[PDB]
Amino acid sequence: VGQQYSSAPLRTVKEVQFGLFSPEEVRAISVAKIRFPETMDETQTRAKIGGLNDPRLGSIDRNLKCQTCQEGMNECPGHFGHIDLAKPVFHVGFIAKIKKVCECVCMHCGKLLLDEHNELMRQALAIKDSKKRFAAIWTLCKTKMVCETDVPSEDDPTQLVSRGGCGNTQPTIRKDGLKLVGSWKKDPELRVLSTEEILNIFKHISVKDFTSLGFNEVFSRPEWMILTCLPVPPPPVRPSISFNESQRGEDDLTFKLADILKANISLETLEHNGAPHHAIEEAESLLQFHVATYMDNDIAGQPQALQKSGRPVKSIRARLKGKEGRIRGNLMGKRVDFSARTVISGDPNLELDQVGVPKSIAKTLTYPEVVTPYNIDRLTQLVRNGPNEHPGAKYVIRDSGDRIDLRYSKRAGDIQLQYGWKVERHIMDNDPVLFNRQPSLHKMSMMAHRVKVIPYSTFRLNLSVTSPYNADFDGDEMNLHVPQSEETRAELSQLCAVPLQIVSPQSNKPCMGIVQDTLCGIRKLTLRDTFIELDQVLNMLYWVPDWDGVIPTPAIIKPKPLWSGKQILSVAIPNGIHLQRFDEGTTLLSPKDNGMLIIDGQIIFGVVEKKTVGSSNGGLIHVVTREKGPQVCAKLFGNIQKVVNFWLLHNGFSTGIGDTIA
Amino acid sequence: NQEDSMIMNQSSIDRGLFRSLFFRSYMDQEKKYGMSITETFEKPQRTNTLRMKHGTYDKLDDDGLIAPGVRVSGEDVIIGKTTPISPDEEELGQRTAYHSKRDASTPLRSTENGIVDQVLVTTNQDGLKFVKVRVRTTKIPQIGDKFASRHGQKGTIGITYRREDMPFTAEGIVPDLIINPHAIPSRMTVAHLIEC
Amino acid sequence: CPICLTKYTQLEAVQLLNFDRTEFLCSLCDEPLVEDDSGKKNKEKQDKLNRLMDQIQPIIDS
Amino acid sequence: NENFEDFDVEHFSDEETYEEKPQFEQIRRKTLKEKAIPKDQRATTPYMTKYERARILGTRALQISMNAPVFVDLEGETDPLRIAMKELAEKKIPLVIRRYLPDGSFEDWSVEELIVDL
Amino acid sequence: RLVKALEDIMVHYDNTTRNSLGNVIQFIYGEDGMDAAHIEKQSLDTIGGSDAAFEK
Amino acid sequence: MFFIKDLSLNITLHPSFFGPRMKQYLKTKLLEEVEGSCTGKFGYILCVLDYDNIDIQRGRILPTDGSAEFNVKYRAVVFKPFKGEVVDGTVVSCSQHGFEVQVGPMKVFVTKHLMPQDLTFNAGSNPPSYQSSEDVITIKSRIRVKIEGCISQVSSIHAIGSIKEDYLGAI
Amino acid sequence: RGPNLNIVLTCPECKVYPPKIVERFSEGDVVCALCGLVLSDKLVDRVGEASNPLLDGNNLSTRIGKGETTDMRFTKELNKAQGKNVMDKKDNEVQAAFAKITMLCDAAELPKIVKDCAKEAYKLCHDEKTLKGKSMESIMAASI
Amino acid sequence: QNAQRDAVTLFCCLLRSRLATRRVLQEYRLTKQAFDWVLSNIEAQFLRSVVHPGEMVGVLAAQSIGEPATQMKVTSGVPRLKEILNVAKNMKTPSLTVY
Amino acid sequence: RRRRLKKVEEEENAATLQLGQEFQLKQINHQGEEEELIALNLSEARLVIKEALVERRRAFKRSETREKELESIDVLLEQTTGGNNKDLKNTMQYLTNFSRFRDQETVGAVIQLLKSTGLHPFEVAQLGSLACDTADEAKTLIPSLNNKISDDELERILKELSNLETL
Amino acid sequence: IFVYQNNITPSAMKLVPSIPPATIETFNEAALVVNITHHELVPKHIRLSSDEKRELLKRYRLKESQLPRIQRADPVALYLGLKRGEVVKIIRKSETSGRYASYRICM
Amino acid sequence: AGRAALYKEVYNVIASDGSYVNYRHMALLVDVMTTQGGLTSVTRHGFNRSNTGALMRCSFEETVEILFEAGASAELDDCRGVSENVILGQMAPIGTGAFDVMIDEESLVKYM
Amino acid sequence: LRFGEMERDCMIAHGAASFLKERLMEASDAFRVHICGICGLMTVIAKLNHNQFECKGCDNKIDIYQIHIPYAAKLLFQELMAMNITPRLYTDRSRDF
Ligand SMILES: [Mg+2]
Ligand SMILES: [Zn+2]
Ligand SMILES: [Zn+2]
Ligand SMILES: [Zn+2]
Ligand SMILES: [Zn+2]
Ligand SMILES: [Zn+2]
């Protein structure tokens, strides 16, 4: 059914601007204030208002609408909530940056310790990129342990000029877990710097000051690095799974948000009802730890938040990183529809650009063909055939976007197709499909073939195409992919087609060649002793599909009409092809029959071997695909394979234990 | 038979060459979550059970279990189980007061089929009734089935030929299997030849 | 809206009125909106204002 | 599950190896009319590229599959890709290609004037 | 690693080889502007041989 | 308020309209989605001026849909309301909540709290109206109203009116 | 009372209530059995922890434990912070009583269903005005 | 234009090595129309050999280097390739070749 | 160009000359140059729309009392505008009923009268639209006129517009 | 150009930056025994003028940051006395096109 | 000269086992490795630190740390890279995407 | 079936950009989401039946666009917002190439 029509303009994302939420923006975009750690109500059957699964945040049930946008599961993107923290906390991924900014700026008035009055500071401000400039400023100002309310003049060090400083001694700041401790210089007294103090000092940092530190005035202020209003992700981010559709197991993020809410309520009650400063610090440390492990559970030197079963809580950072994260496992690569996988098998009777697709796979995979006057009759016949018969169709998509399954519709009568409708019909012969073998190291390991629907359960493919795929038939499996639009179908067959990838750009030589039985039989066929009698010659000539119908004059007329193997293999070679290769000891007479001479597509001398029809530069494949084109070279592959495989079928080739005996 | 493929004789396959039995056992237990939330092995009906699977339930008996010997096909229910729900809800449109239960039945695998070989009813350690249903089928060798010698010479069936299409000796003996010569020299599997 | 417990301003009430031009219908419940009391107690707030100020009169004089 | 000794490499799984080794302007501005390079001084190739040919064939076949007017005499051909190739053969495709220079400027090349040598 | 370091390198319509930022890697691709598939090994006849064979 | 503006609209032409006379399909489709259309950014667009020459840019084919996106630039007359402006009109409907006055193509609702207290509702009279000691406000009656608030969505504009200020009401 | 927020899968063409609806799970569709029109596509068929909201209620808590690189000083302070919580004292004592239920049933080799039934019986009879002066061991024994 | 001449100077060296006046008149024995055909086909095959703009040559280069590595005194092979791609201050067999 | 949020702005108010960022005094036309914002009174807009409609009717062909005017504009709307013209019909009947001036001579006279006042384009069309009778009435109906025009000049403008008003 | 023997004291090295436009370059004698430019791996570096650099940026439609870089400690950069923002045309032998001319800006 | 030596070493590694790779691929590798004035390694601290877009850089390694340092520094991703358009699901400006296809009105009236 | 990272790389090497877009969008996850023009965040309440779009905070109803991104991309952006990062998506350029 797709998604409902929207009157908003359809645009593409041209720029992505990064930054940090203001605490004001979290409350501004929030649709609810989360106040209760519970998710279910007091009847354990509706969602609690103000809880973690508040209906204003969105719905993750197919039968429940969102309270805010009044849309279903597939349309509502989810809406954010917010938690007002009792005390501000550090962001766990910004602790080192907070510490560096703390070393940069004053801990008493919130001003940069070194200004343009210093020579080494001025060149640090002249650095264009923010990261290198901030690193230079931090390395220069980490050793300055005084605000320097009075500094020597730049023009001459004879008179003293007073900047806007307090002159206080900046403590050495070091981290011990989730908190920062400062030790003032002894005339060292160590004390823990509270997060509210750091937030207040970061609020006093001027616009020109943190811009020199690399912080944008609009998008990322240093004061926004301190968390005082925690955003609450919608239930689409943290769905409640079901083990047997009777348990209500929640996500790990829901558990962490419940713990954060419990710590926040505990801190609020301790502050409101009075508590010793040890208890307040302990509660705010617990809240800081819960927020940190909610954003990052794997912290060096910290305990890990654990589930009830003892497994570590999967934080958001764990959900993003790795090959199973959102980036690498869900965005850079992903599982896709309209794809198939089975064992591959060889087929010498297929073309180079053909894949033998199983009939069940063909009946499962579909292509949506738009109804035109050119295919109204064929698509009507495919709709009448139905989904249980190949060729047929499985769905009819109307112009309104409604999709009619062709199952549960024959009882409703026939469907009259209109122009512009789509028919999701089974993939038929000569449909361009992408065909791929993992690991897929190079581009020739994923190429476009044409479908030939076959009555067995394996993918069938030509033997010459196994070398670019690095594919065997000892149980190898290869993926199929079906394009779903005319653009992808067209650029699949005009860029990714198998004949177009015959010559590899990796080594400027062909990557597809005559291999295995065809190579052995093409060496045995083109020996001087190999003479073929008339009946077998006619059967060979008919096996070449583009044979022009003229029987070549035999190499021996009398006393018996005998054709040589070179003569019949030359029928597969197109006319106008000239090849000349001299091996060791090769002259115009070839006593060893080595080398190669092909004139006008006719083999003059030379046994045809890996140097001629293999994947080698200057071979027959390279010359034919450079002179005649890729389609003619694919036809050459097919013709050579057919004629040589027929000859080796009626000749035979073996190997045995006696071949290993000297 | 190129690139580790092998040509198997179809006539040999018809006489039982490499034909195998395949058994698959399905286990299911009725667990008591509490007082009213308990599972029951029963044959569900469309009138009073919600979220029924689209596969057939007609092969089940009164206990929700299929008798041994009955042929099963893909996505067919072999163990029938239902769990109670909260009455008078509003979900999926097709929810009424008659729907006091939902279906928690165990269907067969979507591609598998066969014959129910043995159905075993017993109790676990907790005393809850649980069942095991064994389904038996033939695996007849076809194109793509993997076969190996005793020497690391693995490969799938490229094609099957009948006896009259296979090569034959002067004694009328045809192979059950044709493997490629090119699997021999690079792998240096001399012991395959000496074994033959 | 007494059913969904949601507020609606006078600006967005007019965009939700029916074809009969008689009642304002809810966005979700499709129920006739009932009128709030923003302005009926406003003078009372002013009265509360008055009842604060004399009560805060010794503070400001100090 | 299963227990197989048939070694199947997990693909896109290099993070195992990653965890093994973790330790070691002047001529045009904004979007003015100077973005459009005039026809008399177009410096790009007059030949249609393989990507240009592929996307023109795809776009034309997509339009033909959605009842666009066909500008060539069909010989009984019904497949939209073959009709698009017939249109490209005798230069009856009413499209242009906006080739984007790396600085944001572009050149407009009509499909009719581009040489399809490939 | 090689793919991720080179995933944004493209030949542009000025035949310069540039990354996503537009930084020029090669001012012409392969220093000759040629597709690799259209390259064959050929013998340079002037560089080899003797001076007498060159004159002949 | 009536203005004349230069507006640019993105029109997605289906490939079925890729004929020799595609420009007149583009101009005809331009009128059908602009003439009388309401946009919250520019108000109620009424008529398209300068029809003889309309700036039609070169349309870009959408990379997955096949339709062509044109940026048609045109000069049109619009009616955009504002708060704090005085407009005349005629009443088209009346109720206990208030009466709707038709100004231009727009219906301004005058709430019951934003009238002088002498006016009261009378549903017994046909048609229902508001009766005061000096004037009556009935259907198809001239009335001058000051717009104090206008809400503009992406495709609709609703305005709130008052007649409490002096030199307003019936003319 | 309250917002509806209910989605019904009704065919807009057959107009039959209740509709014959087939959930084609393999094809990920919800279709009408009469006309074949799809109603909702891309349907949803692990990542969290199982928690039944009938035995321990709607309590969502995570404990603090040793990781790969963990200091002993930080763990003890967080454990004392978690222990010194006043709002979950009833939850703490009911989990202690449930632990005693499991300890007594496991010392008797009673089946798991007995443990579950005793736990839910204790939960249902907990915090009762008529049951306040009785000893904890008597409650324990009667629940078992 | 200078970049164009520098790009085609090696192919022009090859072309002058092949299409010299002595070699055409004595070895190849070409006629007027044959020579015109040779020149036209050399020009056409040259203009067909130019890399198409838009080609993702970086991924092509990365795959064309990585795949022969998958088919793979001083260190060589995969560890030497790793010590090259990781610009490492140390290496197993640092060496000179002094002439 | 900055991508800042800048989500805070004053509400569009006719009293304080705030008509929005897309109704500023200066407008960038399709040719790119700055040009004065065009505001029409109720009589001028009717003539502009009628001229546009008869121009469209002429282009299609080549390719007074209020009662006889209403049928003429009705048949013009039927023969010129296609579907979804209900808003345009309501606008045309609104401009016909609330028309202070009939012919283009009176409208041009009003324009040259108000072009020498030096006021905003928005407020002069409001002065030409509303049938004000008192200078204080014009000041309280249009709050932008306070400390902007003298009372005697405003009285002269109102009495001359009332003299130029017909039917 | 100051060609010292072993080392420069940091007390004298700090005043090596002097009044513009005077530039001071310090070279060690051991690093200048062998001319690096004569090495077969080192190709021909030619410093471009301001108008040549402007024409190079115009014809390729380039910015300063989009050029290949050479650092202002490179031995050829010190040999040529490159200041920041100076572009050298590097002519080198190419096995695919005989001659190839790259460009590098000094950073 | 460092680039030439790097090419020679890469060529020695490639042709050590007799495998042949065309010159332009290794040339592109050594030109990317030397385009910044020094030998930039193909590592997390090499090419991945160049300011080529945060969504591109997070795809390789240190995803969350790069996203954090982009959020703190307010990095503007111009979405010109392949990985940005892959993440955003729009057609990357590569291959067939390296241009725009626009309908020609002047040739449309010319055909008939 | 996994259309993994290096499958994407091989499709890049072919230059088949529209097929690469189709695999990642029309074959796995094509999600339409509205963003306002003021802030690039996805916090736009959209009633499609009533045709009403509104972003709270920005308080704009006339500056809304719809985009087609993967659902995994939407999930990424929402996780980044949960981690106090703004993935502000804008539909127009601000700086020259
Ligand atoms: Mg294998
Ligand atoms: Zn919602
Ligand atoms: Zn200070
Ligand atoms: Zn409601
Ligand atoms: Zn139906
Ligand atoms: Zn916003």
Coordinates of C-alpha atoms and ligand atoms in Angstrom, one line a residue, chain A residues 55-59 65-72 75-79, chain L residues 45, ligand 2:
Chain A
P55 CA 1.8 7.2 23.4
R56 CA 2.8 10.8 22.4
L57 CA 6.3 9.5 21.6
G58 CA 4.9 7.2 19.0
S59 CA 3.5 3.6 18.6
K65 CA -1.8 4.9 16.3
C66 CA 0.6 7.5 17.5
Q67 CA -1.1 10.1 19.8
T68 CA 0.9 13.0 18.3
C69 CA 0.8 12.6 14.5
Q70 CA -2.2 10.2 14.4
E71 CA -0.4 7.8 12.1
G72 CA 0.3 4.1 12.1
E75 CA 4.2 6.3 8.8
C76 CA 5.0 7.7 12.3
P77 CA 8.8 8.3 12.6
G78 CA 8.6 8.5 16.4
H79 CA 8.7 11.6 18.6
Chain L
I45 CA 4.5 16.5 13.2
Ligands
ZN2 ZN 3.7 9.8 15.5

